[PDB]
Amino acid sequence: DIPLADASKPTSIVDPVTNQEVLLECINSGSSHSCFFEDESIKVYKSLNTSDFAAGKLILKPLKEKGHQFVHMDTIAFYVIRGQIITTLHKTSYYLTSGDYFYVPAGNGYNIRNLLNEESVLHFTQLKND
Amino acid sequence: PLADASKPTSIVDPVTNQEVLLECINSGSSHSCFFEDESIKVYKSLNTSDFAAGKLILKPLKEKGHQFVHMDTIAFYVIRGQIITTLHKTSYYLTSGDYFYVPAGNGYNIRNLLNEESVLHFTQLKN
């Protein structure tokens, strides 16, 4: 026994500051997303998005290179759900597969290349710093 | 031109503006931590002073147990499973591909509805 709630509506949670209950979106269920971006090479879904962080999936299209990007004051953590990729941080690059993790430390550049003729999927967590 | 995943990575320090060594990659079966109880298995694969990242495994039909997170926020992504998640006083059905976070100053629980392992990715944001 546990009654369930509607995952599409906000949750009543505790604010540590007020010590009072506030409504907040803490669930992202099904095909809800905050944001979507698509180019020649990638798709990006942001499923969780707050002022502190964001999380979602990065999809590398068949045999495509994400393209070197510089991250600023933020830090991005990745987990490879399914795929075979080559990741470059700064100037060094590594072979990675389903199950591997990596992060991009603030003030660095990274690139990712899809080795498979199928989609590669990565979970990402973006830590917003100022 | 490929490098060794098991050794650190020469990356740029935004403060010193110079190359410093840092561990940025966790490949294969490497992990820093492993925790296991009657219901849970936890692997921490990435760990720094800002955050950590890894996999939470609910054992068949097991309940995690209410735990309070203090000043931390924990983000979850369901890789493969069907679960009931409780945030504060509210409970939700979630399945593969669903996301949720536990905001600082709140309790949460997770109960595995499958007679197989349910697997979540987690990211701790340390305060």
Coordinates of all heavy atoms in Angstrom, one line a residue, chain A residues 2-7 9-14 16 21 24-30 47-48 50 53 55-57 77 79 81 86 89-90 92-96 100-103 105-108 123 125 127, chain B residues 1-5 7-12 14 19 22-28 45-46 48 51 53-55 75 77 79 84 87-88 90-94 98-101 103-106 111 121 123 125:
Chain A
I2 N 0.7 2.1 -1.0 CA 1.1 3.5 -1.1 C 0.3 4.1 -2.2 O 0.5 3.8 -3.4 CB 2.6 3.7 -1.5 CG1 3.6 2.9 -0.6 CG2 3.0 5.1 -1.5 CD1 5.1 3.0 -1.1
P3 N -0.6 5.1 -2.0 CA -1.1 6.0 -3.0 C 0.0 6.6 -3.8 O 1.0 7.0 -3.3 CB -1.9 7.1 -2.3 CG -1.7 6.8 -0.8 CD -1.2 5.4 -0.7
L4 N -0.2 6.7 -5.2 CA 0.8 7.4 -6.0 C 0.3 8.8 -6.5 O -1.0 9.0 -6.4 CB 1.1 6.5 -7.2 CG 1.8 5.2 -6.9 CD1 2.0 4.3 -8.2 CD2 3.1 5.3 -6.2
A5 N 1.2 9.6 -6.9 CA 0.8 11.0 -7.4 C 1.0 11.1 -8.9 O 1.5 10.1 -9.5 CB 1.7 12.0 -6.7
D6 N 0.6 12.2 -9.5 CA 0.7 12.6 -10.9 C 2.1 13.2 -11.2 O 2.4 14.3 -10.7 CB -0.4 13.6 -11.2 CG -0.5 13.9 -12.7 OD1 0.5 13.9 -13.4 OD2 -1.7 14.0 -13.2
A7 N 2.9 12.5 -12.0 CA 4.3 12.8 -12.2 C 4.5 14.0 -13.1 O 5.6 14.5 -13.2 CB 5.0 11.6 -12.8
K9 N 2.8 16.7 -12.5 CA 2.5 17.9 -11.7 C 3.7 18.1 -10.7 O 4.4 17.1 -10.5 CB 1.1 17.9 -11.1 CG 0.0 17.9 -12.1 CD -1.4 17.7 -11.6 CE -2.4 17.8 -12.7 NZ -3.8 17.7 -12.1
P10 N 3.8 19.3 -10.0 CA 4.9 19.5 -9.1 C 4.8 18.7 -7.8 O 3.7 18.3 -7.5 CB 4.9 21.0 -8.8 CG 3.8 21.6 -9.7 CD 3.0 20.4 -10.2
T11 N 5.9 18.5 -7.1 CA 5.9 17.7 -5.9 C 6.0 18.7 -4.7 O 6.7 19.8 -4.8 CB 7.1 16.8 -5.8 OG1 7.1 16.0 -6.9 CG2 7.2 16.0 -4.5
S12 N 5.3 18.5 -3.6 CA 5.4 19.3 -2.4 C 6.7 18.8 -1.6 O 6.7 17.7 -1.1 CB 4.2 19.2 -1.6 OG 4.2 20.1 -0.5
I13 N 7.7 19.7 -1.6 CA 8.9 19.4 -0.9 C 9.3 20.5 0.1 O 8.7 21.6 0.1 CB 10.1 19.1 -1.9 CG1 10.4 20.3 -2.8 CG2 9.9 17.8 -2.7 CD1 11.3 21.3 -2.2
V14 N 10.3 20.2 1.0 CA 10.7 21.0 2.1 C 11.8 22.0 1.6 O 12.8 21.5 1.0 CB 11.1 20.2 3.3 CG1 11.8 21.1 4.3 CG2 10.0 19.4 3.9
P16 N 14.7 24.0 2.9 CA 15.6 24.1 4.1 C 15.6 25.5 4.8 O 15.8 25.6 6.0 CB 17.0 23.7 3.7 CG 16.8 23.0 2.4 CD 15.5 23.5 1.8
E21 N 6.9 23.8 3.3 CA 6.7 23.0 2.0 C 6.5 24.0 0.9 O 5.7 24.9 1.0 CB 5.6 22.0 2.2 CG 6.1 20.8 3.1 CD 5.1 19.6 3.2 OE1 4.3 19.4 2.3 OE2 5.1 19.0 4.3
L24 N 7.7 22.1 -6.3 CA 8.9 22.0 -7.1 C 8.8 20.8 -8.1 O 8.3 19.8 -7.8 CB 10.1 21.9 -6.2 CG 11.5 22.1 -6.8 CD1 11.7 23.6 -7.1 CD2 12.6 21.6 -5.9
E25 N 9.4 21.0 -9.3 CA 9.4 20.0 -10.3 C 10.6 19.1 -10.1 O 11.7 19.6 -10.5 CB 9.3 20.6 -11.7 CG 8.0 21.2 -12.1 CD 7.8 21.5 -13.6 OE1 8.9 21.4 -14.3 OE2 6.7 21.9 -14.0
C26 N 10.5 17.9 -9.6 CA 11.6 17.1 -9.2 C 11.5 15.8 -10.0 O 12.5 15.0 -10.0 CB 11.6 16.8 -7.8 SG 11.5 18.2 -6.7
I27 N 10.4 15.5 -10.7 CA 10.2 14.4 -11.6 C 10.2 14.8 -13.0 O 9.6 15.9 -13.3 CB 8.9 13.7 -11.2 CG1 8.7 13.4 -9.7 CG2 8.7 12.4 -12.1 CD1 9.7 12.3 -9.2
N28 N 10.9 14.1 -13.9 CA 10.7 14.2 -15.3 C 10.5 12.8 -15.9 O 11.4 12.1 -16.1 CB 11.9 15.0 -16.0 CG 11.5 15.4 -17.5 OD1 10.9 16.4 -17.7 ND2 11.8 14.5 -18.4
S29 N 9.2 12.6 -16.3 CA 8.7 11.3 -16.6 C 8.3 11.2 -18.1 O 7.9 12.3 -18.7 CB 7.4 11.1 -15.8 OG 7.0 9.7 -15.8
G30 N 8.5 10.1 -18.7 CA 8.1 9.9 -20.1 C 9.0 10.7 -21.1 O 10.2 10.6 -21.0
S47 N 16.4 17.2 -19.5 CA 15.2 16.6 -18.7 C 15.1 17.3 -17.4 O 14.0 17.5 -16.9 CB 15.3 15.1 -18.7 OG 15.5 14.6 -20.0
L48 N 16.2 17.5 -16.7 CA 16.2 18.2 -15.4 C 17.0 19.5 -15.6 O 18.0 19.5 -16.2 CB 16.8 17.4 -14.3 CG 16.2 16.0 -14.0 CD1 17.1 15.2 -13.1 CD2 14.8 16.2 -13.5
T50 N 17.7 23.2 -13.3 CA 17.6 24.1 -12.2 C 18.6 25.2 -12.4 O 19.4 25.2 -13.3 CB 17.6 23.4 -10.9 OG1 19.0 23.1 -10.5 CG2 16.9 22.1 -10.9
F53 N 21.9 23.0 -11.5 CA 22.4 22.0 -12.4 C 21.4 21.7 -13.5 O 20.3 22.3 -13.6 CB 22.7 20.7 -11.6 CG 21.5 19.8 -11.3 CD1 21.2 18.7 -12.0 CD2 20.6 20.2 -10.3 CE1 20.1 17.9 -11.7 CE2 19.5 19.4 -10.0 CZ 19.2 18.3 -10.7
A55 N 20.4 18.0 -16.3 CA 20.8 16.6 -16.7 C 19.9 16.2 -17.9 O 18.8 16.7 -18.1 CB 20.5 15.7 -15.5
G56 N 20.5 15.3 -18.7 CA 19.8 14.7 -19.8 C 20.6 13.7 -20.6 O 21.6 13.2 -20.1
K57 N 20.2 13.5 -21.9 CA 20.9 12.7 -22.8 C 21.5 13.5 -24.0 O 20.9 14.4 -24.5 CB 19.9 11.6 -23.4 CG 19.7 10.4 -22.4 CD 18.3 9.8 -22.5 CE 18.3 8.5 -23.2 NZ 17.2 7.6 -22.8
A77 N 29.6 16.2 -16.4 CA 29.9 14.8 -16.1 C 29.1 13.9 -17.1 O 27.9 14.2 -17.4 CB 29.5 14.5 -14.7
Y79 N 28.1 9.8 -18.6 CA 28.1 8.4 -18.5 C 27.7 7.8 -19.9 O 26.7 8.3 -20.4 CB 27.2 7.9 -17.4 CG 26.9 6.4 -17.4 CD1 27.9 5.5 -17.1 CD2 25.7 6.0 -17.9 CE1 27.7 4.1 -17.2 CE2 25.5 4.6 -18.0 CZ 26.5 3.7 -17.6 OH 26.2 2.3 -17.7
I81 N 25.8 5.3 -21.9 CA 24.8 4.4 -21.8 C 24.9 3.3 -22.8 O 24.9 2.1 -22.5 CB 23.4 5.0 -21.9 CG1 23.1 6.0 -20.7 CG2 22.3 4.0 -22.0 CD1 21.9 7.0 -21.0
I86 N 35.2 8.0 -29.1 CA 36.5 8.5 -28.8 C 36.4 9.9 -28.2 O 35.8 10.8 -28.8 CB 37.5 8.5 -30.0 CG1 37.8 7.1 -30.4 CG2 38.8 9.3 -29.7 CD1 38.7 6.9 -31.6
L89 N 39.8 15.3 -24.2 CA 39.8 16.4 -23.2 C 41.1 17.1 -23.4 O 42.2 16.5 -23.5 CB 39.7 15.9 -21.8 CG 38.6 14.9 -21.5 CD1 39.2 13.5 -21.5 CD2 37.9 15.2 -20.2
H90 N 41.0 18.5 -23.5 CA 42.2 19.3 -23.8 C 42.8 18.7 -25.1 O 42.3 19.0 -26.2 CB 43.1 19.4 -22.6 CG 44.1 20.5 -22.8 ND1 43.9 21.7 -23.4 CD2 45.4 20.5 -22.4 CE1 45.0 22.4 -23.4 NE2 46.0 21.7 -22.8
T92 N 44.5 15.3 -25.1 CA 44.6 13.9 -25.0 C 43.2 13.3 -25.3 O 42.2 13.9 -24.9 CB 45.2 13.5 -23.7 OG1 44.7 14.2 -22.6 CG2 46.7 13.6 -23.7
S93 N 43.2 12.1 -25.9 CA 42.0 11.4 -26.4 C 42.0 9.9 -26.1 O 43.1 9.3 -26.3 CB 41.7 11.7 -27.8 OG 42.7 11.3 -28.6
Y94 N 40.9 9.4 -25.7 CA 40.7 8.0 -25.2 C 39.6 7.3 -25.9 O 38.6 7.9 -26.3 CB 40.3 8.0 -23.7 CG 41.2 8.8 -22.8 CD1 41.0 10.1 -22.5 CD2 42.3 8.2 -22.2 CE1 41.8 10.9 -21.6 CE2 43.2 8.9 -21.3 CZ 42.9 10.2 -21.1 OH 43.8 10.9 -20.2
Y95 N 39.7 5.9 -25.9 CA 38.6 5.0 -26.4 C 37.7 4.6 -25.2 O 38.2 4.2 -24.2 CB 39.2 3.8 -27.1 CG 38.3 2.7 -27.4 CD1 37.0 2.9 -27.9 CD2 38.6 1.4 -27.2 CE1 36.1 1.9 -28.2 CE2 37.8 0.3 -27.5 CZ 36.5 0.6 -28.0 OH 35.6 -0.4 -28.3
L96 N 36.4 4.8 -25.4 CA 35.4 4.5 -24.3 C 34.2 3.8 -24.9 O 34.0 3.9 -26.1 CB 35.0 5.9 -23.7 CG 36.0 6.7 -22.9 CD1 35.5 8.0 -22.5 CD2 36.6 5.9 -21.7
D100 N 31.4 3.5 -19.3 CA 32.5 4.3 -18.8 C 31.9 5.7 -18.5 O 30.9 6.2 -19.0 CB 33.6 4.3 -19.9 CG 34.0 2.9 -20.4 OD1 33.5 1.9 -19.8 OD2 34.8 2.9 -21.3
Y101 N 32.6 6.4 -17.6 CA 32.3 7.8 -17.2 C 33.5 8.7 -17.5 O 34.6 8.2 -17.8 CB 32.1 7.8 -15.6 CG 31.1 6.9 -15.1 CD1 31.3 5.5 -15.1 CD2 30.0 7.3 -14.4 CE1 30.4 4.6 -14.6 CE2 29.1 6.4 -13.8 CZ 29.3 5.1 -13.9 OH 28.4 4.1 -13.4
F102 N 33.2 10.0 -17.6 CA 34.2 11.0 -17.7 C 33.6 12.4 -17.3 O 32.4 12.6 -17.4 CB 34.9 11.1 -19.0 CG 34.0 11.4 -20.2 CD1 33.7 12.7 -20.5 CD2 33.6 10.4 -21.1 CE1 32.9 13.0 -21.7 CE2 32.9 10.6 -22.2 CZ 32.5 11.9 -22.5
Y103 N 34.4 13.3 -16.9 CA 34.0 14.7 -16.7 C 34.9 15.7 -17.4 O 36.1 15.4 -17.7 CB 33.7 15.0 -15.3 CG 34.8 15.3 -14.3 CD1 35.1 16.5 -13.8 CD2 35.7 14.2 -13.9 CE1 36.1 16.7 -12.9 CE2 36.7 14.4 -13.0 CZ 36.9 15.7 -12.5 OH 38.0 15.9 -11.6
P105 N 36.5 19.2 -16.7 CA 36.7 20.2 -15.7 C 36.6 21.6 -16.2 O 37.1 21.9 -17.3 CB 38.1 19.9 -15.2 CG 38.6 18.7 -15.9 CD 37.7 18.6 -17.2
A106 N 36.0 22.5 -15.5 CA 35.7 23.9 -15.9 C 37.0 24.6 -16.4 O 38.0 24.5 -15.7 CB 35.1 24.7 -14.7
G107 N 36.9 25.2 -17.6 CA 38.0 25.9 -18.2 C 38.8 25.0 -19.2 O 40.0 25.1 -19.4
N108 N 38.1 24.0 -19.8 CA 38.7 23.1 -20.7 C 37.8 22.8 -21.9 O 36.6 23.1 -21.9 CB 39.0 21.7 -20.0 CG 40.2 21.8 -19.1 OD1 41.3 21.6 -19.5 ND2 40.0 22.2 -17.9
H123 N 24.5 9.8 -20.9 CA 23.9 10.7 -19.9 C 24.8 11.8 -19.5 O 26.0 11.6 -19.5 CB 23.5 9.9 -18.6 CG 23.1 10.8 -17.5 ND1 21.7 11.0 -17.2 CD2 23.7 11.6 -16.7 CE1 21.6 11.8 -16.3 NE2 22.8 12.2 -15.9
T125 N 25.4 15.4 -16.9 CA 25.1 16.2 -15.7 C 26.0 17.4 -15.8 O 27.2 17.4 -15.8 CB 25.2 15.4 -14.4 OG1 25.6 14.0 -14.8 CG2 23.9 15.3 -13.7
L127 N 26.9 20.9 -14.1 CA 27.0 21.6 -12.8 C 27.2 23.1 -13.1 O 28.3 23.5 -13.6 CB 28.2 21.1 -12.0 CG 28.3 19.6 -11.8 CD1 29.4 19.2 -10.9 CD2 27.0 19.0 -11.4
Chain B
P1 N 45.7 8.3 -32.3 CA 46.6 8.8 -31.2 C 45.8 8.7 -29.9 O 45.3 9.7 -29.4 CB 47.0 10.2 -31.6 CG 45.8 10.7 -32.4 CD 45.2 9.5 -33.1
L2 N 45.9 7.5 -29.2 CA 45.1 7.2 -28.0 C 45.9 7.1 -26.8 O 47.0 6.6 -26.8 CB 44.3 5.9 -28.3 CG 43.1 5.9 -29.3 CD1 42.7 4.6 -29.8 CD2 41.9 6.6 -28.6
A3 N 45.3 7.5 -25.6 CA 46.0 7.6 -24.3 C 45.4 6.6 -23.3 O 44.3 5.9 -23.6 CB 45.9 9.0 -23.8
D4 N 46.0 6.4 -22.2 CA 45.7 5.4 -21.2 C 44.6 5.9 -20.2 O 44.8 6.9 -19.5 CB 47.0 5.0 -20.4 CG 46.8 3.9 -19.4 OD1 45.6 3.5 -19.1 OD2 47.8 3.4 -18.8
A5 N 43.5 5.2 -20.2 CA 42.3 5.6 -19.5 C 42.5 5.4 -18.0 O 41.8 6.1 -17.2 CB 41.1 4.8 -20.0
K7 N 45.2 6.0 -16.2 CA 46.1 7.0 -15.7 C 45.4 8.4 -15.8 O 44.5 8.6 -16.6 CB 47.5 7.0 -16.3 CG 48.2 5.7 -16.4 CD 48.5 5.1 -15.0 CE 49.1 3.7 -15.1 NZ 49.1 2.9 -13.8
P8 N 45.8 9.4 -15.0 CA 45.2 10.8 -15.0 C 45.2 11.4 -16.4 O 45.8 10.9 -17.4 CB 46.0 11.6 -14.1 CG 47.2 10.7 -13.7 CD 46.8 9.3 -13.9
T9 N 44.6 12.6 -16.5 CA 44.6 13.4 -17.8 C 45.2 14.8 -17.5 O 44.8 15.4 -16.6 CB 43.2 13.6 -18.3 OG1 42.5 12.3 -18.4 CG2 43.1 14.2 -19.7
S10 N 46.2 15.1 -18.4 CA 46.7 16.5 -18.3 C 45.7 17.5 -18.9 O 45.5 17.6 -20.1 CB 48.0 16.5 -19.1 OG 48.0 15.6 -20.2
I11 N 45.1 18.2 -17.9 CA 44.1 19.2 -18.2 C 44.5 20.6 -17.7 O 45.5 20.7 -17.0 CB 42.7 18.8 -17.7 CG1 42.7 18.8 -16.1 CG2 42.3 17.4 -18.3 CD1 42.1 20.0 -15.5
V12 N 43.7 21.6 -18.1 CA 44.0 23.0 -17.8 C 43.4 23.5 -16.5 O 42.2 23.2 -16.3 CB 43.6 23.9 -19.1 CG1 43.4 25.4 -18.7 CG2 44.6 23.7 -20.2
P14 N 41.9 26.5 -14.6 CA 41.4 27.9 -14.8 C 42.0 28.9 -13.9 O 41.9 30.1 -14.2 CB 39.9 27.8 -14.6 CG 39.7 26.5 -13.7 CD 40.8 25.6 -14.2
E19 N 48.8 23.4 -17.3 CA 48.5 22.0 -17.3 C 48.8 21.3 -15.9 O 49.9 21.5 -15.4 CB 49.2 21.2 -18.4 CG 48.5 21.1 -19.7 CD 49.2 20.5 -20.9 OE1 50.4 20.9 -21.1 OE2 48.6 19.7 -21.6
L22 N 44.9 15.3 -13.5 CA 43.6 15.1 -12.8 C 43.0 13.8 -13.3 O 43.2 13.5 -14.5 CB 42.7 16.3 -13.0 CG 41.5 16.4 -12.2 CD1 41.8 16.5 -10.7 CD2 40.6 17.6 -12.5
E23 N 42.3 13.1 -12.5 CA 41.6 11.9 -12.9 C 40.2 12.2 -13.4 O 39.4 12.7 -12.6 CB 41.6 10.8 -11.7 CG 43.0 10.3 -11.4 CD 43.1 9.9 -9.9 OE1 42.2 9.3 -9.3 OE2 44.2 10.2 -9.3
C24 N 40.0 12.0 -14.7 CA 38.8 12.5 -15.3 C 38.0 11.3 -16.0 O 36.9 11.5 -16.4 CB 39.2 13.4 -16.4 SG 39.8 15.0 -15.8
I25 N 38.6 10.1 -16.1 CA 38.1 9.0 -16.8 C 38.0 7.8 -15.8 O 38.9 7.5 -15.1 CB 39.0 8.6 -18.0 CG1 39.4 9.8 -18.8 CG2 38.4 7.5 -18.8 CD1 38.5 10.1 -20.0
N26 N 36.8 7.2 -15.8 CA 36.6 5.9 -15.1 C 36.0 4.9 -16.1 O 34.8 4.9 -16.3 CB 35.7 6.1 -13.8 CG 35.8 4.9 -12.9 OD1 36.7 4.8 -12.1 ND2 34.9 4.0 -13.0
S27 N 36.9 4.0 -16.6 CA 36.5 3.1 -17.7 C 36.5 1.6 -17.1 O 37.1 1.4 -16.0 CB 37.4 3.2 -18.9 OG 38.8 3.0 -18.5
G28 N 35.8 0.7 -17.8 CA 35.8 -0.7 -17.4 C 35.2 -0.9 -16.0 O 34.1 -0.4 -15.7
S45 N 31.9 6.0 -9.3 CA 32.9 5.9 -10.3 C 33.6 7.2 -10.5 O 34.8 7.2 -10.8 CB 32.2 5.4 -11.6 OG 31.9 4.0 -11.6
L46 N 32.9 8.3 -10.4 CA 33.5 9.6 -10.3 C 33.3 10.2 -8.9 O 32.2 10.1 -8.4 CB 32.9 10.6 -11.4 CG 33.1 10.2 -12.8 CD1 32.3 11.1 -13.7 CD2 34.5 10.2 -13.3
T48 N 34.8 13.8 -6.7 CA 35.6 15.0 -6.4 C 35.0 15.7 -5.2 O 34.1 15.1 -4.6 CB 35.7 15.9 -7.7 OG1 34.4 16.7 -7.8 CG2 36.0 15.2 -9.0
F51 N 31.2 17.0 -6.6 CA 30.2 16.0 -7.1 C 30.8 14.6 -7.0 O 32.0 14.4 -6.8 CB 29.7 16.4 -8.5 CG 30.6 15.8 -9.6 CD1 30.3 14.5 -10.1 CD2 31.7 16.5 -10.1 CE1 31.1 14.0 -11.1 CE2 32.5 15.9 -11.1 CZ 32.2 14.7 -11.6
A53 N 29.4 10.6 -9.0 CA 28.6 10.0 -10.1 C 28.8 8.5 -10.0 O 30.0 8.0 -9.8 CB 29.0 10.5 -11.4
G54 N 27.8 7.7 -10.3 CA 27.8 6.3 -10.4 C 26.5 5.6 -10.6 O 25.5 6.3 -11.0
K55 N 26.4 4.3 -10.1 CA 25.2 3.5 -10.3 C 24.7 3.0 -9.0 O 25.4 2.5 -8.1 CB 25.6 2.3 -11.2 CG 25.5 2.5 -12.7 CD 25.5 1.3 -13.5 CE 26.8 1.0 -14.2 NZ 26.6 0.7 -15.6
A75 N 20.8 13.8 -8.2 CA 20.1 13.5 -9.5 C 20.1 12.1 -9.8 O 21.2 11.4 -9.6 CB 20.6 14.4 -10.6
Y77 N 18.9 9.0 -12.8 CA 18.4 8.6 -14.1 C 18.2 7.1 -14.1 O 19.1 6.3 -13.8 CB 19.3 9.1 -15.3 CG 18.9 8.4 -16.6 CD1 17.7 8.8 -17.3 CD2 19.6 7.3 -17.1 CE1 17.3 8.2 -18.4 CE2 19.2 6.7 -18.3 CZ 18.1 7.1 -18.9 OH 17.7 6.5 -20.1
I79 N 18.3 3.8 -15.7 CA 18.8 3.1 -16.8 C 17.9 1.9 -17.2 O 17.5 1.9 -18.4 CB 20.3 2.7 -16.6 CG1 21.2 3.9 -16.3 CG2 20.8 1.9 -17.8 CD1 22.6 3.5 -15.9
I84 N 9.2 2.5 -7.4 CA 8.4 3.6 -6.7 C 9.4 4.4 -6.0 O 10.2 3.9 -5.2 CB 7.3 3.0 -5.8 CG1 6.4 1.9 -6.3 CG2 6.5 4.2 -5.2 CD1 5.5 2.4 -7.4
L87 N 9.5 11.1 -2.7 CA 10.2 12.4 -2.3 C 9.3 13.0 -1.2 O 8.1 13.2 -1.4 CB 10.2 13.3 -3.5 CG 11.0 12.8 -4.8 CD1 10.7 13.7 -5.9 CD2 12.5 12.7 -4.5
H88 N 10.0 13.3 -0.1 CA 9.3 13.9 1.1 C 8.1 12.9 1.4 O 8.3 11.9 2.0 CB 9.0 15.4 0.9 CG 8.5 16.0 2.1 ND1 9.0 15.8 3.3 CD2 7.5 16.9 2.2 CE1 8.3 16.5 4.2 NE2 7.4 17.2 3.6
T90 N 5.5 12.2 -1.0 CA 4.8 11.8 -2.2 C 5.5 10.7 -2.9 O 6.8 10.7 -3.0 CB 4.6 13.1 -3.1 OG1 3.9 14.0 -2.3 CG2 3.7 12.8 -4.3
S91 N 4.8 9.7 -3.5 CA 5.3 8.6 -4.1 C 4.9 8.5 -5.6 O 3.8 8.8 -6.0 CB 5.0 7.3 -3.4 OG 5.3 7.4 -2.0
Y92 N 5.8 8.0 -6.5 CA 5.7 8.1 -7.9 C 6.1 6.8 -8.5 O 7.1 6.2 -8.1 CB 6.5 9.2 -8.5 CG 6.1 10.6 -8.1 CD1 6.7 11.3 -7.1 CD2 5.0 11.3 -8.8 CE1 6.3 12.6 -6.7 CE2 4.6 12.5 -8.4 CZ 5.3 13.2 -7.4 OH 4.9 14.5 -7.1
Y93 N 5.4 6.3 -9.6 CA 5.9 5.3 -10.4 C 6.9 5.9 -11.4 O 6.7 6.9 -12.0 CB 4.8 4.5 -11.1 CG 5.3 3.6 -12.1 CD1 5.5 2.2 -11.8 CD2 5.6 4.0 -13.4 CE1 6.0 1.3 -12.7 CE2 6.1 3.1 -14.4 CZ 6.3 1.7 -14.0 OH 6.8 0.9 -14.9
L94 N 8.1 5.2 -11.6 CA 9.1 5.6 -12.6 C 9.7 4.4 -13.3 O 9.7 3.3 -12.7 CB 10.2 6.5 -12.0 CG 9.8 7.8 -11.3 CD1 11.0 8.5 -10.6 CD2 9.2 8.8 -12.4
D98 N 13.4 7.7 -17.1 CA 12.8 8.7 -16.2 C 13.9 9.3 -15.4 O 14.9 8.7 -15.1 CB 11.7 8.2 -15.4 CG 10.4 7.8 -16.2 OD1 10.3 8.1 -17.3 OD2 9.6 7.1 -15.6
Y99 N 13.7 10.6 -15.1 CA 14.7 11.4 -14.3 C 14.0 11.9 -13.0 O 12.8 12.2 -13.1 CB 15.2 12.6 -15.1 CG 16.0 12.4 -16.3 CD1 15.4 12.1 -17.5 CD2 17.4 12.5 -16.3 CE1 16.2 11.8 -18.7 CE2 18.2 12.3 -17.4 CZ 17.6 12.0 -18.6 OH 18.4 11.8 -19.7
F100 N 14.7 12.1 -12.0 CA 14.3 12.8 -10.8 C 15.5 13.3 -10.0 O 16.6 12.7 -10.0 CB 13.3 12.0 -9.9 CG 13.9 10.8 -9.2 CD1 14.2 10.8 -7.9 CD2 14.3 9.6 -10.0 CE1 14.7 9.7 -7.2 CE2 14.8 8.5 -9.3 CZ 15.0 8.6 -8.0
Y101 N 15.3 14.4 -9.2 CA 16.3 14.8 -8.2 C 15.6 15.0 -6.8 O 14.4 15.3 -6.7 CB 17.1 16.0 -8.7 CG 16.3 17.3 -8.7 CD1 16.6 18.3 -7.8 CD2 15.4 17.6 -9.6 CE1 16.0 19.6 -7.8 CE2 14.7 18.8 -9.7 CZ 15.0 19.8 -8.7 OH 14.4 21.0 -8.7
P103 N 15.9 17.3 -3.7 CA 16.4 18.6 -3.3 C 17.0 18.6 -1.9 O 16.5 17.9 -1.0 CB 15.2 19.5 -3.4 CG 14.0 18.6 -3.1 CD 14.4 17.3 -3.7
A104 N 18.0 19.5 -1.7 CA 18.6 19.5 -0.3 C 17.5 19.7 0.7 O 16.6 20.5 0.5 CB 19.7 20.6 -0.3
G105 N 17.7 19.0 1.8 CA 16.8 19.1 3.0 C 15.5 18.3 2.9 O 14.5 18.7 3.3
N106 N 15.6 17.1 2.3 CA 14.4 16.3 2.0 C 14.8 14.8 2.2 O 16.0 14.5 2.0 CB 13.8 16.6 0.7 CG 13.0 17.9 0.6 OD1 11.8 17.9 0.9 ND2 13.7 19.0 0.3
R111 N 11.8 1.9 -4.2 CA 11.4 0.5 -4.0 C 11.4 -0.2 -5.4 O 10.7 0.3 -6.3 CB 10.1 0.4 -3.3 CG 9.6 -1.1 -3.1 CD 8.7 -1.2 -1.9 NE 7.4 -0.4 -2.1 CZ 6.4 -0.9 -2.7 NH1 6.4 -2.1 -3.2 NH2 5.3 -0.1 -2.8
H121 N 21.5 5.6 -12.7 CA 22.6 6.5 -12.6 C 22.3 7.6 -11.6 O 21.2 8.1 -11.5 CB 23.0 7.1 -14.0 CG 23.9 8.2 -13.9 ND1 25.3 8.0 -14.2 CD2 23.8 9.4 -13.3 CE1 25.9 9.2 -14.0 NE2 25.0 10.0 -13.4
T123 N 24.1 11.3 -9.5 CA 25.0 12.3 -9.4 C 24.7 13.1 -8.2 O 23.6 13.7 -8.0 CB 25.0 13.3 -10.6 OG1 25.0 12.6 -11.9 CG2 26.0 14.4 -10.6
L125 N 25.5 16.3 -5.9 CA 26.1 17.6 -5.8 C 26.4 18.0 -4.4 O 25.4 18.3 -3.6 CB 25.2 18.6 -6.5 CG 24.4 18.3 -7.8 CD1 23.6 19.4 -8.2 CD2 25.4 17.8 -8.9

